[PDB]
Write a protein that binds this ligand. Structure first.
Ligand SMILES: *[C@@H]1O[C@H](CO)[C@@H](O)[C@H](O)[C@H]1NC(C)=O
Lengths: 102, 51
């Protein structure tokens, strides 16, 4: 979420130097209201681009009043990305990022 | 075409350097049947075909 008053355009890199392949499970938060987008991610509309040297995935969050499931009108879209040995992971996001811990 | 259209919007992100470049190109294909017509509509970022 936002820190104080600014959500920076994160641009991290995670190289795969291991001898085995890695699977990264990451998500994208979809707010229910336009206020929820800014009071949590500041920017008017987020963008998650988890890319590698072979495949990229650019996701744009949706802001709609969805049916109340588990007491919430907002959802989270879970995605995946496989990083082969030698490939590098590049997560580029300016908001609405459910980053993977590992 | 008169049977199928393909609208593509380019992405502007800092991708890893592959062969010394951070930009890529997405190639698609379209088949035009006899009688069908090919209509290419672009205002930028077009890799036009020769034939
Ligand atoms: C993102 O980080 C990588 C590695 O740290 C760097 O090569 C690249 O230039 C950065 N891109 C931006 C837009 O900061």
């Amino acid at each position: 979420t936002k820190s104080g008053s600014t959500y920076p355009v994160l641009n991290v890199t995670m190289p795969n130097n291991d001898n085995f392949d890695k699977l990264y499970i990451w998500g994208v938060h979809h707010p229910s209201t336009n206020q929820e987008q800014t009071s949590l991610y500041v920017q008017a509309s987020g963008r998650v681009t988890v890319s590698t040297r072979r495949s990229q995935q650019t996701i744009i969050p949706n802001i709609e009043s969805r049916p109340w499931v588990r007491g919430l009108s907002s959802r989270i879209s879970i995605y995946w990305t496989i990083v082969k040995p030698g490939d590098v992971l590049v997560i580029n996001s300016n908001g609405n990022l459910i980053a993977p811990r590992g």
